[PDB]
RNA sequence: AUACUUACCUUAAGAUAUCAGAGGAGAGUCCUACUGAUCAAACAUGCGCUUCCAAUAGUAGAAGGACGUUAAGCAUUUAUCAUUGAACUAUAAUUGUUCAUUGAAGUCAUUGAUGCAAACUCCUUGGUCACACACACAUACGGCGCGGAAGGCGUGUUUGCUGACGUUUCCAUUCCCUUGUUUCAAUCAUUGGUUAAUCCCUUGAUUCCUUUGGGGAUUUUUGGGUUAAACUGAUUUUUGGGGCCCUUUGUUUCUUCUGCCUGGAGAAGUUUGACACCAAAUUCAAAUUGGUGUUAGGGGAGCUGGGGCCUUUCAAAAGAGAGCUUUGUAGAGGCAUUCUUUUUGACUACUUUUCUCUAGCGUGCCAUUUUAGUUUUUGACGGCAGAUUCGAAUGAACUUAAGUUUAUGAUGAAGGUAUGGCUGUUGAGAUUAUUUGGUCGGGAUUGUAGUUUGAAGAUGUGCUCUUUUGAGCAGUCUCAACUUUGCUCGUUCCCGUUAUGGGAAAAAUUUUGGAAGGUCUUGGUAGGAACGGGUGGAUCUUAUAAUUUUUGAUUUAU
RNA sequence: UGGUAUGUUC
């Protein structure tokens, strides 16, 4: 889908990407990751869960496929019953804009620590 | 048998993607337009599309970034093209195109007509005179 | 907010990339602002790299959807079991048919569910960008504009996970304009250049005076100095016109106040601060406490990091001088000699037979000389025909004029000019004769003669080993380094001399690394370096291969 | 050698 996912990136670098994560059933969840852990428990913002019916599976066996989509919103999915994750869609704001946003967050956090040091005195 | 197409979209950075786009916008539900990741056949001096549309030709030169050319099987397919549309703006990505008969036909047109190679040698000599 | 009581708890460890070598500490372990290599992270930086970035010369369209409509669209499929009564098909827990009493749960949904298919409408995204509405291409497309988004590859610097607190008897320490943009015209001021007047220093030239030399004036010739009458590039104050935008929806969104569509503004402040808002008990308002979010964008001077080009200087490598005849030294390597006998293996010559280009001269084959022929060249040159043209300079004709044709047509340029050809000249490629030359026997079989090795004798100078024809060293041969003598070729310069030698640079020039300057482009501009942690977050190992993910009961098969 | 939460008085 001409996204060109990064060639040397991991889960700390794939954050806030619109993932298309596959499970053991095939119940594909599409949404933005915002956190993970050692067991790969993924929170998913604006997530949608898509499946294929049993009648559509005969047409899928060797065209249009009518998938069943349900809307989950902000969910938190476990890492046991998942199989694979890919990157489907890029986020809204770019890498330089995320860098400027992270510098603003660091400056705001340093200002908050200076405010806590001023309130402690 | 070359046709000059003018007021075409400017910048798709790949040439074969613009070829797929143009063969999609000439006729819907084409064999090569509905299926991506298909190797485009090259025709040297094979029918590629229906209604006689043989191939296209674009370039990245700064003087004619928008407009391009197309070539067919023969003059009868071009006459059928201009008799099927008959002064009607065919739709592409956002704009209305305009077609015409070019003052100089394609080199593939010379390959079709002469085989029913000196002009390539003349063009090489003209390029040698221009690059000097 | 202080003071006190009560309820719960008081901590799994070890470490921060890997390999090789050297040194230190009393086989094993630790350290090195120790050295080389790999890898990781950060910041810059470049690869004619890879993909994408939506009409406005219109009322569209690309990607993703509608958890939107037509749509109760069209075609199909299901909507509980058991006992008994009046008939009953009947292997069942009377299954099947019509009616009912009773018994346990009892998805809603049948406008339901699945499949199929078209049209309409609406949402989120973009460079809705700078020039032009243009004749390119077999080496398939001049990817040689300003950027942005995603990614690959390559180079340089720093560090070996990163961030807060404290200390340093550590370094640090800038500003200016702007809060719709752009263009054109008018006016003031400033800077840089050109022309002349009051002019001035030097000089090519003109004129006059005077003592070889100099002085007066002009050309302000050449360069510079004073002043600013005229012209040109740039900045700035004000006014006016034209184009676009105002969704900036709280009318610029950095904040506050005033204020706005006959306009787009004015004033103040900016990171130990300020502004706006939410929540509350104190019984209006007001005040107090806990949090949230903002403090922006563009341009310019200075400093600094990095990328590319050019110039100056130093160090290193080739060029530099090389090739050869002679001497001495000594390095490496190889073997020392000769005859006879035997004929162990090889080679040559001759005999017999067989086969082969023809068994032999010639013929034929091989080299190639362009001497000649034939043939070929996106070969080259010149010219002819489509008009050979163009520097449309000039003359003439057709013609208002333009345009066309033709000449002055080699004075200069375009291979010819063709999108059909052709002429003549020249070289090169192939063949044959020839300037000429070489070649005409080879393979298989049989025996002999000659040379050398396997072996025996005599030998050849001496040392080590040894049964010995024996192997190593002095011996001898060949080659490389120093060294000298003359010849030849030769980079540059000089000299004997332009034959050729002598001397010097042992050079001019190419590359790499380092030092400096100029120009093009980009980023940053207020925090940074060291140490300390009963510091916080990340990464690895073991608990942890056993019910909680991660060391398996999800390919539905007996 | 401590932390979290809660209730009274100033």
Curated annotation (Swiss-Prot), chain A:
Residues 6-91 form the Sm domain. It comes from the Eukaryota. Keywords: Cytoplasm, mRNA processing, mRNA splicing, Nucleus, Ribonucleoprotein, RNA-binding. One of its GO terms (molecular function) is snRNP binding. It is found in: Nucleus; Cytoplasm. A motif (Nuclear localization signal) lies at residues 95-121. The keyword RNA-binding applies. The keyword Cytoplasm applies. Residues 98-108 have a biased composition (Basic and acidic residues). GO terms for cellular component: catalytic step 2 spliceosome; commitment complex; cytoplasm; nucleus; Prp19 complex; spliceosomal complex; U1 snRNP; U2 snRNP. One of its GO terms (biological process) is mRNA splicing, via spliceosome. Belongs to the snRNP SmB/SmN family. C-terminal extension may function as a nuclear localization signal (NLS). Plays a role in pre-mRNA splicing as a core component of the spliceosomal U1, U2, U4 and U5 small nuclear ribonucleoproteins (snRNPs), the building blocks of the spliceosome. Present with 861 molecules/cell in log phase SD medium. This is Small nuclear ribonucleoprotein-associated protein B. It comes from Saccharomyces cerevisiae (strain ATCC 204508 / S288c). The chain holds residues 2 to 131 of 196 of the full protein.
Swiss-Prot record, chain B:
It comes from the Eukaryota. It is found in: Nucleus. Residues 1-104 form the RRM domain. Changing residue 3 to I: Sensitive in DMS protection of U1 snRNA. Involved in nuclear mRNA splicing. The principal role of the U1A is to help fold or maintain U1 RNA in an active configuration. It is the first snRNP to interact with pre-mRNA. This interaction is required for the subsequent binding of U2 snRNP and the U4/U6/U5 tri-snRNP. Belongs to the RRM U1 A/B'' family. Present with 2950 molecules/cell in log phase SD medium. Component of the spliceosome where it is associated with snRNP U1. This is U1 small nuclear ribonucleoprotein A. The gene is MUD1. The chain holds residues 2 to 148 of 298 of the full protein.
């Amino acid at each position: 889908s001409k996204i060109q996912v990064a060639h040397s990136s991991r889960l700390a670098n794939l954050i806030d990407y619109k993932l298309r994560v596959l499970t053991q059933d095939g119940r594909v969840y599409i949404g933005q990751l915002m956190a993970f852990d050692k067991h790969m428990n993924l929170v998913l913002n604006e997530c949608i869960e898509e499946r294929v019916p049993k009648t559509q599976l005969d047409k899928l066996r060797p065209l249009n496929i009518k998938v069943e989509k349900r809307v989950l919103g902000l969910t938190i999915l476990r890492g046991e019953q998942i199989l694979s994750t890919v990157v489907e869609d890029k986020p809204l704001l770019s890498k330089k804009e995320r860098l400027v946003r992270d510098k603003k967050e660091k400056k705001q956090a340093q200002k908050q620590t200076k405010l806590r040091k001023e309130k402690e005195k | 048998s070359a046709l000059y197409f003018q007021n075409l979209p400017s910048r798709p950075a790949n040439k074969e993607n613009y070829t797929r786009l143009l063969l999609k916008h000439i006729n819907p539900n084409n064999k090569y337009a509905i299926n991506p990741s298909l190797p485009l056949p090259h025709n040297k001096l094979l029918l590629d599309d229906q209604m006689g549309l043989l191939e296209v030709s674009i370039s990245r030169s700064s003087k004619m970034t928008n407009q391009a050319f197309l070539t067919f099987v023969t003059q009868e397919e071009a006459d059928r093209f201009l008799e099927k549309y008959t002064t009607t703006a065919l739709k592409v990505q956002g704009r209305k195109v305009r077609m015409g008969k070019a003052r100089t036909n394609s080199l593939l047109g010379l390959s079709i007509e002469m085989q029913k190679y000196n002009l390539d040698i003349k063009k090489v000599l003209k390029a040698r005179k221009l690059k000097r």
